[PDB]
Amino acid sequence: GYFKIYSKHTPINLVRDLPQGFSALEPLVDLPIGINITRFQTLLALHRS
Amino acid sequence: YGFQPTNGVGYQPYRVVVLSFELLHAPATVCGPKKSTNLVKNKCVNFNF
Ligand SMILES: *[C@@H]1O[C@H](CO)[C@@H](O)[C@H](O)[C@H]1NC(C)=O
């Protein structure tokens, strides 16, 4: 019933390709929800201007 | 109820609040408060952090 989220923000010196290296992720959040999960999605900001 | 200020007790309005604690099957939730005392130093002590 806890939804844990770890995260890390590293700066690449590329724009959009997966690099190589080691970087450990530090815990961010903890939510005592109870929710069941089986699926997920993503959200994007369109092109309009 | 036509309540009026010159009513004998037992006909005057009473406000009621009913607290109902429930325990479904989650991981945890709200509870009483905690009381932290003073923290000594340099003495064999029995501690709880
Ligand atoms: C999540 O789904 C399963 C389906 O097998 C169900 O048995 C379970 O009770 C659900 N989780 C909760 C917390 O109810």
State whether B26 and A2 contact (CB < 8 Å): no
B26: closest chain A residue by CA: A34
Contacts of B31 in chain A (CB under 8 A): none
Resolution at which this structure was determined, Å: 3.1
Q: Using CB atoms within 10 A of its CB, is residue A38 exposed (0-12), middle (13-18) or buried (19+)? A: exposed
CB A4 within 8 A of CB A23: no
- Locate tokens 């064999």: which residue? B44
Q: Which of B47, B20, B49, B19 is nearest to B34 (CA)?
A: B49
* Angstrom distance (rounded) from CA B31 to CA B18: 17
Beta bridge partners of A7: A26
d(CA A9, CA B8): 70
